[PDB]
Amino acid sequence: TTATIEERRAFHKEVLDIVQSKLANKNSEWARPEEPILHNLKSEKEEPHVYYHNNNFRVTRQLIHFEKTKIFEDELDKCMRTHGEAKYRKCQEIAKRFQASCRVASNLERGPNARKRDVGFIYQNNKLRELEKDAKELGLNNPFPPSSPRTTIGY
Amino acid sequence: VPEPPYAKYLANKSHYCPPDFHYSREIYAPYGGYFNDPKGWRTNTAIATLVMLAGAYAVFCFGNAREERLRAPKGWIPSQLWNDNVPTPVDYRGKVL
Amino acid sequence: MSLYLFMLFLQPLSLSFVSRSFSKISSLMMSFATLWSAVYMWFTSNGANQTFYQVVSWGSDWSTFGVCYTSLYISLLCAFIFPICVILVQGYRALSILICIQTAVSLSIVSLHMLAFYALFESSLLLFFILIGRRKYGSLSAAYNISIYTFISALGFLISAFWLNWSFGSVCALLPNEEANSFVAFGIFILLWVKAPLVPFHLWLPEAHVYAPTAGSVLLAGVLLKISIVGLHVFFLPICASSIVKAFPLILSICLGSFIFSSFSTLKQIDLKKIVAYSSISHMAIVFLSSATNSGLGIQGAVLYCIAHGLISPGLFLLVGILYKNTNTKLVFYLRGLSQQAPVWWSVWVFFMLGNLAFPLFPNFIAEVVCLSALFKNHELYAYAFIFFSFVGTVYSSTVLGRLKGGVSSQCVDASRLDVISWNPLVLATVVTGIGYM
Amino acid sequence: AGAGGPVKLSPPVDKPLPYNYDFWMDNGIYPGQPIYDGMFGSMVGNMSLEYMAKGWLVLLPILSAPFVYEHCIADDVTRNPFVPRQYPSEVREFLALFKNGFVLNDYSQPDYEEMKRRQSGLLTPIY
Amino acid sequence: MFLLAVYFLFFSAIANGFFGRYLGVRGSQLLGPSALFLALLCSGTIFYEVCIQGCSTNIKLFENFVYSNELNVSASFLYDPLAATMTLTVVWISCAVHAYQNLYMRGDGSQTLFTSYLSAFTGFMLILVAGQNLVMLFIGWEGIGVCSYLLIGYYGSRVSAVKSANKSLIVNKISDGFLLGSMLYLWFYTGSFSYCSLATFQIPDVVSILVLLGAIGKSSQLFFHVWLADAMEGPTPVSALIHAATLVTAGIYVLCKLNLHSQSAVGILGAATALMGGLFGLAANDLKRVIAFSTCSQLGYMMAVLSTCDDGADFAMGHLVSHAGFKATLFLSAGLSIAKENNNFLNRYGSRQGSPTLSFATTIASLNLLGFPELGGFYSKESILNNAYINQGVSIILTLATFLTAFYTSKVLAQLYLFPYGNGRQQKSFDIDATTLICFGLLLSEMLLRIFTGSSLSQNMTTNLPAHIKNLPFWVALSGALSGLATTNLFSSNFMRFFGNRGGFDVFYARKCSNVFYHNAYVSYTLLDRGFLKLY
Amino acid sequence: ADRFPPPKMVATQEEMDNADIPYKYRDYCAHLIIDFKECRYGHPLTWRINCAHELHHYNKCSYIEFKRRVAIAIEEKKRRGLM
Ligand SMILES: CCCCCCCCCCCCCCCCCC(=O)OC[C@H](COP(=O)([O-])OCC(O)COP(=O)([O-])OC[C@@H](COC(=O)CCCCCCCCCCCCCCCCC)OC(=O)CCCCCCCCCCCCCCCCC)OC(=O)CCCCCCCCCCCCCCCCC
Ligand SMILES: CCCCCCCCCCCCCCCCCC(=O)O[C@@H](COC(=O)CCCCCCCCCCCCCCC)COP(=O)(O)OCC[N+](C)(C)C
Ligand SMILES: CCCCCCCCCCCCCCCCCC(=O)O[C@@H](COC(=O)CCCCCCCCCCCCCCC)COP(=O)(O)OCC[N+](C)(C)C
Ligand SMILES: CCCCCCCCCCCCCCCCCCCC(=O)O[C@H](COC(=O)CCCCCCCCCCCCCC)COP(=O)(O)OCCN
Ligand SMILES: CCCCCCCCCCCCCCCCCCCC(=O)O[C@H](COC(=O)CCCCCCCCCCCCCC)COP(=O)(O)OCCN
Ligand SMILES: CCCCCCCCCCCCCCCCCCCC(=O)O[C@H](COC(=O)CCCCCCCCCCCCCC)COP(=O)(O)OCCN
């Protein structure tokens, strides 16, 4: 994928038009965008308007994710408190969903140096499954535990 | 040594103070002095008890509003007399009460 | 924003026209007005504007000022802590110097231009040379140390700013620029390395704090160290992220080494002010590392911990100043029986020392938890290293408290009405932040 | 009398102080103490570190002898005369999941090898 | 209703320690015990509602205590069966200690501050026990740590007391650091701090080791037991609270609340701590020290039982609750003996006319410690010893610890009462008020109720053991008690000396660890910042 | 293991959940532990005297299960040839 200077300047002109259309009507939610500005730029920093708008969209999304995770945690805690000793069987699904939400929130914007948050040990379990499959098929002896059905309340 | 003029304002040694023990009476501490026993203590303690009961009332109101019982008690609990959010008791067999 | 900047420019201006006898009263009223204007700036800052809450320009790129999350917290902290410094200082000369230093520092935080940032922060260079080197209670060595360290670091930052202004054509933060150059990154980094004390460039700080007046020490620890985090968030991470990621093993080595060596050095200190200064150096390392991770958890944690330090270190420096006024000594060996002799000073001292140790009901606990979580997000070992070595702070603090707590003393050295008035805002703010209103 | 008892005051310093005088804790009462007792000066009971080490050398083998047998010499089959508690299949499968459980040592079970490998799990998180 | 208990204790703390000038010494002697009585009524209601009638409740005070990005924790209290049982025991012991302090601390200048610290200490213990998330537990853990620092070092003009407090603080810092690391591991890989979602079937060894290292601090296990013996510098009411419930129990509570422990480690560490503590208590000549070593031994038994079986957590908590009563009684009686005789050494005690209540309470507490049949201590200890038979190593060590425990306990009982008078012919006296009698009535009531109500559901469940193996703990206890009455010599002078020096853990720390610490500080400062890098 | 087959499980999942029986206690004796648990909690302080029939019955069932476990162990040991 290569971007010619003609295409780059064309996109720049289109971006300016998008800014002009946004400027025409006042919006109190200008910095809480519901949709990103789609682009094929090598670096987002090239188009400043796209960079700022998309950053504001990403912040909005992350805030929403954090609140969704809090909601998921509240339903998991209520479910756990209602069932009693049947919590392990009945709250597997809610827990699975909560852990998925935690991963989505943490992983989306972890940062340049941060590792992926393995909520539920899904990645570790997957790695152990691959290692087992390889050892068994190649006749090797695995020095690691075999993959587990359940490693956490959900995942 | 002739006691300084301000020494008249300061309090005497309390009954609980050992006679040999000497302490500087000018030093102020929020927790009280070396042996305390102030005059008017009975009133202060009554005021304290009233503030304690009022705060207990406020705490009770707050707790009752925030106490969430999501699983039915096995039998009757005292909370039913004061809180209406208690689920109807179900016994070990499963029969509702 | 405009009201805050105007009040900032009025505070140095007011001194020129005062009666020379009303100076202290006018300065206090101006400081409170600046605090109220900062509250107004907070009120007029809508969270809906996610990137920058407010930006104002007065005709040039240099006069571009704006407030962000880091800027807002630091500016509010400076306005909150300045009244205490004002009341602690006496004399027109001292007031003039302090008010000029404060105006320069407060203008630096809100500046969005690297060259303007440099112009405003380094204006208060001679004033610190003169303040730390005052006739009777000052040391020329400390003044020379702080001045030379600041000049060399800021000159490197200036060279990097000049290259960025030449290459991109602008040095304003609001214009998105990225650079992969390592020389320019190092130039910007060296300022942060020196200003926020990091081993081995931390020697200037303890000397300055010991030989500075209590108002000066309070201002220095409270906000001058924080100016590094504004430069990092506003002038380093946006442009030189690639170099921070490239050098992360080195950054981590230098930050952890600073934390360890500073903690060990605090153990050999016999002066209360030096103990508080080395505690600050140790505390700065977590903030620097957390911000360098370039994660949401790290930037928020670093700013929060900075506020907690900017509320806990001024308290300790204020109590130390009060004690020194009462006794004319800072040697822990001469100070004994403070529990029995000063029950009110002792209570506040113990409370602030507990705050410095990051106990749960203090802002330091929440801040540390967030910073440690950010480190754990990077690597588990990174968090573990910092968590384990925290015991060294406990050993020195416990030894100091134990030496001060008991013994035989023949002097009643307790705080007056003025001293309690000066710490009450700091105590209330510490409590409020501790309960979670961060 | 708990309060007001006589005390002896430590004499004021009258000679040049050693560089490492911070190792001594003196509150003004006569018996000052090292920062850590036993770091220097008189040792309690006149017992050196060498004496304590020789004692621990004599004691350690006798204390470790019970533990080494069962943990190392003994095996799952021979440790106890019975098998671990038997559970219904639904209960047993869930209980086997716990690494710190007691049902993983059931040699009679056809899933013994997997359970044993589960018990000797990972030292650190892989991710 | 559930919040009320914590409110009463924190109120009593604020009142006595901030408004003591108004309340007075007498005002603290009223507000303290009154608040503790009200908290006992609330704790009893909580115990009946949760434990007996299986009704757990969650009270969320406020949300978003910490809200940085994904990380979110709330201040919430979940009263589960473990929380209710511990709340009840803690409040009962604290109410007794508050009643005791009225007469014991009359001769102390700050009785208002002492009462304030005792009530804040009890409040932080109830926060730790009732927390619904790991952050609330940490808040309680640190609060008890700080209150212990402020209470052990209460006598500031004694260098020993300040050093004992510094020791406690440093050891507890190392432990809470390991706990913070474990909590970070658990938050990262489970997504929450709440114990409901915290559940993990398989945990990496690192988290288990970190949890154990964190727990061994408060529950003074081997290598971390140095602070407990030193904590004797503080006043007697402090020692009763810390040893019986507030501090030693927290580690066990943490291990039982989150079952991340490893069977191999807990069993060996526990059995070792039981034996070492009993041996250390054999050499000890201070009354208060012997009861501390006894606490260490019992903690070893509770830690060891977790390894034996699945019900080990229930057995441990049952022993913990049974132990708190008798151990508190032993400390309060020891304090009264010291106060009446003005002596701390076992050699100078002897038969002397006293109060029937105190002598009986001491005898019954000692019997519970010893293991006398048909007593609360007996059932809770046999539940452990009988179930530990499967682990051959743990069982042998625990039986030897039972022997040593019986020997020192019997020796102490003989020395305090049966032995002829050993103190001097001087006028000494401590008159006991009705408040002290109420305190001993409360402790005896707890001891009696424990026999009727029991400690664990599985307490009387059959352990399928031969009769000779089931009744051996009794024979070993009797043999030790008989040997202790005869005051016979068991070990050579070399070993008696070794045990008197507590194994030389502190001599090792001073000669090597402290010297290395201060050499690192010397290199860091004198050689470098103020040497190489300092201008002429 | 095969020679000594497990006994029939009287307790169902619904009953064990309704009586709040932990998973560890669901070991073929759960019906008796439900009886004992209901009686012990019904009589909070007098259970030791009153609730003795249920404890006896549980202990007997537990004894039979223990004997089964020992039998299984001996059979496995003989199969491996150790004894
Ligand atoms: C229109 C309607 C009217 C409304 C009003 C609006 C008008 C607007 C502005 C008008 C206000 C009047 C301006 C004041 C002029 C004189 C001020 C002065 O002499 O200072 C000391 C003087 C105190 O006099 P004094 O106590 O009677 O004794 C002095 C004796 O003469 C000698 O005493 P000494 O020998 O013992 O010296 C001891 C010395 C110790 O020795 C030192 O420390 C020397 C250090 C060298 C300079 C300090 C370097 C750092 C200074 C940083 C700048 C401070 C602001 C920080 C903000 C950052 C800006 C980038 O300590 C001091 O002197 C004070 C220490 C701190 C003051 C330094 C700040 C002054 C900078 C330059 C002053 C302007 C002079 C211009 C000359 C004009 C014709 C000659 O005035 C003050 O009250 C404090 C300074 C007020 C600063 C405001 C001046 C603006 C300078 C900021 C630069 C920004 C550009 C300018 C634009 C301004 C707005 C357009
Ligand atoms: C010189 C001093 C002399 C005077 C002494 C003053 C005495 C102070 C009394 C101590 C206060 C204890 C109360 C602690 C709770 C803090 C109160 C609080 O924060 O208000 C909460 C409301 O919550 C409450 O009211 C809590 C109930 C308080 C009393 C209930 C029981 C009292 C027992 C104390 C145990 C509290 C344990 C909490 C540990 C974290 C605000 O509600 P939100 O809108 O959700 O605020 C947002 C949350 N956040 C702060 C994080 C931003
Ligand atoms: C969590 C929800 C509710 C929170 C309530 C907490 C309980 C009360 C907290 C009150 C304020 C907390 C800190 C008070 C200031 C710290 C100083 C202090 O506590 O004691 C002072 C003086 O005490 C005071 O004047 C104020 C104390 C009033 C109430 C203190 C209760 C215990 C403090 C709780 C620990 C804080 C928790 C922080 C970490 C969780 C110094 O005492 P000593 O060093 O022992 O010397 C006294 C002299 N003598 C040698 C004779 C012993
Ligand atoms: C292509 C070039 C090749 C390389 C060639 C290099 C040749 C030399 C380069 C050195 C440049 C550094 C400039 C600082 C010199 C050290 C300070 C001078 C020492 C001194 O005595 O100053 C006294 C006080 O200074 C103080 O108290 C300050 C203490 C030391 C300051 C620490 C320096 C700042 C940090 C150093 C590096 C930081 C980052 C580096 C990127 C004042 O003396 P006086 O007034 O009484 O005069 C009387 C005459 N003796
Ligand atoms: C020895 C440990 C290093 C100490 C530093 C520890 C932590 C500092 C990290 C700061 C973070 C951002 C700074 C970016 C790079 C600075 C140092 C990185 C390490 C380094 O030196 O890498 C070099 C490249 O950097 C460069 O080429 C530039 C080096 C810095 C220049 C020194 C002074 C510059 C001052 C200029 C002022 C402003 C100028 C603006 C025009 C050579 O590494 P390599 O890639 O060649 O690998 C070949 C090895 N086999
Ligand atoms: C049941 C679980 C186990 C609980 C504790 C077990 C501890 C067992 C470790 C001791 C057994 C092996 C000891 C090493 C062999 C040394 C034999 C003689 C010792 C010797 O000659 O030098 C000593 C070295 O100190 C030393 O020996 C220190 C080495 C100890 C290694 C670190 C282990 C932690 C020890 C904690 C408690 C042990 C207390 C007594 C060691 C005294 O040296 P010096 O001071 O006279 O030299 C002069 C200063 N220039």
Q: What is the 3-class SS of E387-416, one letter each residue?
A: HCCCCHHHHHHHHHHHHHHHHHHHHHHHHH
Q: Which amino acid is at E329?
A: T
**What is the rounded CA–CA span in Å between residue C386 and residue C369?**
12
DSSP conformation class of E242: I
**What is the rounded CA–CA span in Å between residue E249 and residue C49?**
51
> By three-state DSSP, how is residue E262 classified?
coil
Q: What is the 3-state secondary structure (H, E, C) of E185-207?
A: HHHHHHCCCEHHHHCCCCCCHHH
Instruction: Give the dihedral sign, CA E439/E442/E444/E450.
Output: negative
Print burial letters for D33-52: b (CB count within 10 Å at least 16), e (below 16). bbbbbbbeeebeeebeeebb
Q: Please state whether B94 falls in left (phi above 0), alpha (psi between -120 and 50) or beta.
A: left
Residue F32 contacts residue F61 (beta carbons within 8 Å) = yes
**What is the rounded CA–CA span in Å between residue E61 and residue B67?**
10
Looking at the CA of C130, name the nearest ligand: 1
**What is the rounded CA–CA span in Å between residue E119 and residue E94?**
8
Residue E457 tokens read as 């559901």
Beta partners for E131?
Answer: E77
Helix H or strand E encompassing F63: helix F53-80
Residue E59 contacts residue B74 (beta carbons within 8 Å) = no
Are residues D122 and E205, on separate chains, in Cβ contact within 8 Å? Answer: yes
Q: Atom 19 of ligand 2 has which residue's CA nearest to it?
A: C435
**What is the rounded CA–CA span in Å between residue C140 and residue E65?**
47
**Alpha-helix residue ranges (DSSP H) falling in chain A:** 5-24, 48-83, 87-90, 92-108, 122-138
Which residues fall within 8 angstroms of residue E32, CB to CB, at 6 or more apart? E12, E16, E98, E101, E102, E115, E118, E119
Beta partners for E68?
Answer: E71
Q: Which amino acid is at D62?
A: I
Experimental technique for the deposited model: cryo-EM
**What is the rounded CA–CA span in Å between residue E368 and residue E371?**
5
- What's the N-to-C CA distance of chain C in angstroms? 22
DSSP conformation class of A147: P
Chain F residue nearest residue A86, CA to CA: F17
Q: How many CA atoms lie within 13 A of C21 on its CB side?
A: 0
Gyration radius from chain B CA atoms: 27
CB of F21 within 8 Å of a chain B CB? The answer is no
CB of E495 within 8 Å of a chain D CB? The answer is yes
Chain E residue nearest residue A150, CA to CA: E201
Mutate one of A52, A66, A113, A124 to test the C interface: name it (highest C CB count within 10 A).
A113
Are residues C387 and E177, on separate chains, in Cβ contact within 8 Å? Answer: yes
User: What are φ and ψ of residue F53, in 5° steps?
Assistant: -65, -45
Q: Kindly list the distances between the CA atom of residue E359 and the CA atoms of E352, E363, E445, in Å, as whole numbers in the listed order.
A: 11, 6, 16
CA E358 to chain centroid, in Å, comes to 22
Based on the number of CB atoms within 10 Å of its own CB, is D9 exposed (0-12), middle (13-18) or buried (19 or more)?
exposed
Nearest partner of E472 among E391, E411, E403, judged by Cα: E403
**What is the rounded CA–CA span in Å between residue A82 and residue A80?**
6
> By three-state DSSP, how is residue D27 classified?
coil
Nearest partner of C423 among C271, C327, C317, C329, judged by Cα: C317
Q: Kindly list the distances between the CA atom of residue A4 and the CA atoms of A9, D20, E419, in Å, as whole numbers in the listed order.
A: 9, 73, 103
**What is the rounded CA–CA span in Å between residue C432 and residue C363?**
8
Q: Kindly list the distances between the CA atom of residue E43 and the CA atoms of E34, E90, E299, in Å, as whole numbers in the listed order.
A: 14, 9, 25
Pocket test for ligand 1, best of C127, C128, C134, C151 (most atoms within 8 A of CB): C127
For residue E191, which residues of chain A lie inside 8 Å, CB to CB?
69, 73, 98-99, 102, 119-120
CB of B70 within 8 Å of a chain A CB? The answer is yes
Q: What is the DSSP string of A84-117?
A: GGGHHHHTHHHHHHHHHHHHHHHHHT--SSPPP-
Give the pairing type, strands D33-34 and B67-68.
Answer: unpaired
Are residues C372 and E184, on separate chains, in Cβ contact within 8 Å? Answer: yes
Nearest partner of C154 among C165, C143, C162, judged by Cα: C162
Mutate one of B69, B70, B71 to test the A interface: name it (highest A CB count within 10 A).
B70
Mutate one of B22, B24, B27, B34 to test the C interface: name it (highest C CB count within 10 A).
B27
Tell me whether the omega of the peptide bond preceding residue D66 falls within 30 degrees of 0, making it cis. no
Is chain C adjacent to chain F, meaning 3+ CB pairs within 8 angstroms?
no
Q: How many CB atoms lie within 10 A of CB E514?
A: 20
Residue E430 contacts residue E340 (beta carbons within 8 Å) = yes
Q: How many CA atoms lie within 13 A of E248 on its CB side?
A: 37
Beta partners for C360?
Answer: none
Residue D113 tokens read as 């090898």
Residue F53 tokens read as 């029939």
Residue reference for tokens 């006398």: E372
Question: Does C126 sit in the ligand 1 pocket, CB within 6 Å?
Answer: yes
Work out the angle between the directed axes of helices C140-167 and C182-195 (0-180°, nearest 10).
Answer: 150
**What is the rounded CA–CA span in Å between residue E39 and residue E87?**
10
Beta partners for C271?
Answer: C331
- What's the N-to-C CA distance of chain A in angstroms? 39
Chain F residue nearest residue D106, CA to CA: F73
Beta partners for A88?
Answer: none
Give the pairing type, strands E57-68 and E71-79.
Answer: antiparallel
Chain E residue set in contact with A, beta carbons under 8 Å: 56, 58, 69-70, 72, 188-192, 194, 196-197, 199-202
> By three-state DSSP, how is residue D33 classified?
strand
**What is the rounded CA–CA span in Å between residue C360 and residue E136?**
9
Nearest partner of D9 among D41, D33, D34, D31, judged by Cα: D31
Longest dimension (CA), chain D: 83
CA B70 to chain centroid, in Å, comes to 31
Q: How many CA atoms lie within 13 A of F23 on its CB side?
A: 20
CB of A82 within 8 Å of a chain B CB? The answer is yes
**What is the rounded CA–CA span in Å between residue E138 and residue C369?**
11
**What is the rounded CA–CA span in Å between residue C244 and residue C360?**
32
DSSP conformation class of E208: H
Which residues fall within 8 angstroms of residue A38, CB to CB, at 6 or more apart? none
Nearest partner of E349 among E239, E262, E424, E284, judged by Cα: E424
| Ligand 2 atom at minimum distance from E18 CA | 3
Residue C362 contacts residue C308 (beta carbons within 8 Å) = yes
> By three-state DSSP, how is residue E62 classified?
strand
- What's the N-to-C CA distance of chain B in angstroms? 81
Q: How many CB atoms lie within 10 A of CB A35?
A: 7
Which residues line the pocket of ligand 3, CB cutoff 6 A?
Answer: B 30-31; C 339, 346-347, 350-351, 354, 359-361, 405; E 10, 13-14, 17-18, 110, 113, 116-117, 120, 142-143, 146-147, 150, 154, 156
Nearest partner of E401 among E314, E307, E502, E281, judged by Cα: E281
Q: Which of A124, A146, A149 has the CB atom closest to D126's CB atom?
A: A124
Looking at the CA of E73, name the nearest ligand: 2
User: E strands of B24-83, at which residues?
Assistant: 67-68
Output the CA B60–ligand 2 centroid distance in Å: 14
Residue reference for tokens 């602008």: C170
Any idea how long chain E is? Answer: 536
Query: In chain F, helix, strand, coil percent, each to 5?
Result: 65, 0, 35
Q: What is the 3-state secondary structure (H, E, C) of chain C?
A: CHHHHHHHHHHHHHHHHCCCCCHHHHHHHHHHHHHHHHHHHHHCCCCCCCCCCEEEECCCCCCEEEECHHHHHHHHHHHHHHHHHHHHCCCHHHHHHHHHHHHHHHHHHHECEHHHHHHHHCCCCHHHHHHHCCCCCCCHHHHHHHHHHHHHHHHHHHHHHHHHHHHCCCCECCCCCCCCCHHHHHHHHHHHHHHCCCCCCCCHHHHHHHHCCHHHHHHHHHHHCCHHHHHHHHHHHHHHHHHHHHCHHHHHHHHHHHHHHHHHHHCCCCEHHHHHHHHHHHHHHHHHHHHHCCCHHHHHHHHHHHHHHHHHHHHHHHHHHHHHHHHCCCECCCCCCHHHHCHHHHHHHHHHHHHHCCCCCCHHHHHHHHHHHHHHHHCHHHHHHHHHHCHHHHHHHHHHHHHHHCCCCCCCCCCCHHHHHHHHHHHHHHHHHHCCCC
Q: Atom 45 of ligand 1 has which residue's CA nearest to it?
A: C126
Residue A76 tokens read as 């998991």
Distance from CA of B59 to the nearest CA of A (A): 24
User: E strands of chain F, at which residues?
Assistant: none
- What's the N-to-C CA distance of chain F in angstroms? 16
Chain D residue nearest residue F70, CA to CA: D82
